[PDB]
């Protein structure tokens, strides 16, 4: 695959989330930049549409894995580098646990120089009582390690994990997520042995910034092989 050679320096990256959350509209975009050398993600996300009517935490996992830092020993395992240039869907399922749930789909490619993330995100069932509806969630992430399986029959990738969202009253919500990537390309992409992608996400805000929005740092590390 010469498709890590795309990200071999620092990539642009735009981010583009169409939302509808109990028929709740909203859009976000995000821009900044991956460094895949050192596994690193710099973005801000802001809301340019509507009013968000779920906890930004939620949205982290659906706002480009082709990001992650493979090491030299796992390169042949790099599925989201090895789709590049014309990229990868990306599919997801995320069950809250005793609430609604989020279908998400996206389309990962280049679009020209930069690296860009297009999502459609439909939410349902969520209660007006809920840690997601009622904003109850602690602005906050935690470390996750994210299992990666072949899926040689479906020429991609499958991938579940549980996120635990920290909740203010002293409980945690579980986020259960159902993901699989497929090539948008013909070409040829690797089928990875089973392996993680060790996550570590920072939240932050721009003191500058009046919109909501939400800054993020990430750290991913692929592991186990």
Known sequence: SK????????????????????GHKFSVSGEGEGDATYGKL???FILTTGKLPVPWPTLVTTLVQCFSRYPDHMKQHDFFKSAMPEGYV???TIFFKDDGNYKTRAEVKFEGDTLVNRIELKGID??????????????????????????????????NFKIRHNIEDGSVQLADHYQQNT????????????????????????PNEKRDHMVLLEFVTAAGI
């Open 3 to 22: 498709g890590e050679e795309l990200f071999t320096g620092v990539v642009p990256i735009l981010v583009e989330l169409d939302g509808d959350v109990n």
């Open 183 to 206: 090539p948008i390309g013909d070409g040829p992409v690797l089928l990875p042995d089973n392996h993680y992608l060790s996550t570590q996400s920072a939240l932050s805000k721009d």
């Open 90 to 92: 990306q599919e997801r």
């Open 42 to 44: 710099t973005l801000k």
């Open 126 to 159: 969520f209660k007006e009582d809920g840690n997601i509806l009622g904003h109850k969630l602690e602005y906050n992430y935690n470390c996750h390690n994210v299992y990666i399986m072949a899926d040689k029959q479906k020429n991609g990738i499958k991938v």
